[PDB]
Ligand binder design. Sequence first.
Ligand SMILES: Cc1cn([C@H]2C[C@H](O)[C@@H](CO)O2)c(=O)[nH]c1=O
Ligand SMILES: Cc1cn([C@H]2C[C@H](O)[C@@H](CO)O2)c(=O)[nH]c1=O
Lengths: 233, 233
Amino acid sequence: AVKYLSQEEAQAVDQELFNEYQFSVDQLMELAGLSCATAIAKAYPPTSMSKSPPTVLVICGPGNNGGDGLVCARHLKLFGYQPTIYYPKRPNKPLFTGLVTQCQKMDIPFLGEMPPEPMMVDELYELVVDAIFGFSFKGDVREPFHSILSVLSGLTVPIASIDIPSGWDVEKGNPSGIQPDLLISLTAPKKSATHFTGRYHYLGGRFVPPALEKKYQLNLPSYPDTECVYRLQ
Amino acid sequence: AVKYLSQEEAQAVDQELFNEYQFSVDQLMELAGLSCATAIAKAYPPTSMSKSPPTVLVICGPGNNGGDGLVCARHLKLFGYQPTIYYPKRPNKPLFTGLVTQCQKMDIPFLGEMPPEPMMVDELYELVVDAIFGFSFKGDVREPFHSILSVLSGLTVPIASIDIPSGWDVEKGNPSGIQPDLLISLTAPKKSATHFTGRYHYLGGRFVPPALEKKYQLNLPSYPDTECVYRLQ
Ligand SMILES: Cc1cn([C@H]2C[C@H](O)[C@@H](CO)O2)c(=O)[nH]c1=O
Ligand SMILES: Cc1cn([C@H]2C[C@H](O)[C@@H](CO)O2)c(=O)[nH]c1=O
């Protein structure tokens, strides 16, 4: 079966992709985000939803996982969803400035604030994307993110988490944490994925070179045809 | 029906994407090249080919089109093809250095020379990807590309061309140039595509913003579901 990575293992793979393999951050974040959008459109196809176009709130955190979310949002728009973004803490870098301007020009709105009650999220948004924290998160959830996570915990609509459910320990999980209905593991799942109790677990990031895969014995499943996602279990 | 762009309209679309929309070169080239690999895999699926895995020669020119071929070849490898690259003139810019290193660490070999005779290409490679010149190219074919084009025009195996069949005037085509079996038009087809004679015409580069599509009256077709290509005609 597929290998579930430790936090160290994942940080080592991420290091090689940008070092030995000379991938650019731009690049792999674009493929990551596309997988994310693709898994979401496959698990929650626009046809299956009661609103048209179906609405989605994408919550983007302060780092790279956030960047994935912004990429994910605009492909989701291309796929026929009507996304909305909350992005409260934005790094002051071209990468993220660009990603913001692209979304702004796709007419995707960035909210001024997180809606404060879960009921109000539920009412406006048919799905929530958790793009807050990723694989290199180390455990100190500060405001406004704790607040956001606590609103998410009370939701009735599904949550789709990118790479790891935000607020989970990357290896141990968090039973009192958010419980996403969809998890998109990027490149390979992390050990916290073994505590995943949602219906949908997709693997994404179809860019792992065979030699990187052999070395770390990932045992990736075979992606069908030209798909950038693979549904695990 | 879909709009066929003049070279001028294509350059203005392209410039808007990198200027107002603030996409980065990397992002769009990655998506463009993935579209290419996806269209090939759809037109010439691995099961439909005599050898296993199926072999493909990718010929990359000295600018952005060649960039697309380098991305394309790496995705084709992930999709189960066995590509070989010929890349005789390589700009000294980190964009291309990177894309070359990524290909080499995918273990895709680079040829030192073009096979001199059409028959030898035919015997070694089941498909040839023409990523030599793209939409900016202005009439002038110098070495080694004239000679490579001369080899390509005598092939029996199919040629897949990225954006524009290399050696064709970007609007007027070229009665005596190469005649590809597959054309992958990126973003929107160009006027020269009305002179296309092959079996397969795909549209790729599924990143055009609606507002830009409204602006240039592209009348883009509906990509199905989460696909990054659409079969035209
Ligand atoms: C090893 C590894 C890399 N990545 C890469 C892919 C994306 O470019 C970025 C995630 O934001 O880092 C992961 O997301 N998760 C991982 O476990
Ligand atoms: C408008 C336009 C853009 N592009 C974009 C996509 C790629 O990122 C880059 C080089 O092919 O330019 C085309 O290839 N062809 C076009 O006609």
